[PDB]
Paper text:
Here, we report the crystal structures of a 207-residue MSLN fragment, of fl-MSLN alone and in complex with a therapeutic mAb MORAb-009, as well as the structure of its C-terminal shed-resistant peptide complexed with mAb 15B6. By truncation and alanine replacement mutagenesis, the CA-125 binding site was mapped to a 64-residue fragment at the N-terminus of MSLN.
The tumor-associated antigen mesothelin is expressed at high levels on the cell surface of many human cancers, while its expression in normal tissues is limited. Here, we report the crystal structures of mesothelin that reveal a compact, right-handed solenoid consisting of 24 short helices and connecting loops. These helices form a nine-layered spiral coil that resembles ARM/HEAT family proteins.
Numbering used by the authors: 299 to 507
């Protein structure tokens, strides 16, 4: 079937659409309307197949990848994305990253979230302070999951996002990379605070009994 029943053409994304059959959603809901009103989808308890119809509509409308104007409102529909879907995204806002990471809370990192994080950080050109705040907030061992080579390109400003417990899983090679960056970043600290906060970057426990 390829024709919307009379009077069923959707002019809004609203609760009435939950009663539509799958083919009715396909024939009656325009993809541009859906994309424009993604901020209303997650409050509407569509079934899995209904949401699959909507996701396919977005895929059809955006073969080159959803725009961030839609991504920022995907919500739990993020869990229906494939890694390939996410590789096309250009995500620049940290509010979008926080919104997407919130719906994955309580679970291990999936390939989808890994792709999302990797593409976001590469798009910013570096791991900046606020991004590291967010990533650590959702994944405490993110910083020390990076190799020394990866850590070497982290700007010292981002050290201000590094909390002492974040360094527990780091080894002396990673800490050899991070400690000089921390020396530079804490230039403007008061002496007492500097002495306290610098210690975790030395990882003394790795070197004595």
């Amino acid at each position: 079937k390829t024709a919307c029943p009379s009077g069923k053409k959707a002019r809004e994304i609203d609760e009435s659409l939950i009663f539509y059959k799958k083919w009715e959603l396909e024939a009656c809901v325009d993809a541009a309307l859906l994309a424009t009103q993604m901020d209303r989808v997650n409050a509407i308890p569509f079934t899995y197949e209904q949401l699959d119809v909507l996701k396919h509509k977005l895929d059809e409308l955006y073969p080159q990848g959803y725009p961030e104007s839609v991504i920022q409102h995907l919500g739990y529909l993020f869990l229906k994305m494939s890694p390939e879907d996410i590789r096309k995204w250009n995500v620049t806002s940290l509010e979008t990253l926080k919104a997407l990471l919130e719906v994955n809370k309580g679970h291990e990192m999936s390939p989808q979230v890994a792709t999302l994080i990797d593409r976001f950080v590469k798009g910013r050109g570096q791991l900046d302070k606020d991004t590291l705040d967010t990533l650590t907030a959702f994944y405490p061992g993110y910083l020390c999951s990076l190799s020394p080579e990866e850590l070497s390109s982290v700007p010292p400003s981002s050290i201000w996002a590094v909390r002492p417990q974040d360094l527990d899983t780091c080894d002396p090679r990673q800490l050899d990379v991070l400690y000089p960056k921390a020396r530079l970043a804490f230039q403007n600290m008061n002496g007492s605070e500097y002495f306290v906060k610098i210690q975790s970057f030395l990882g003394h426990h790795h070197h004595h009994h």
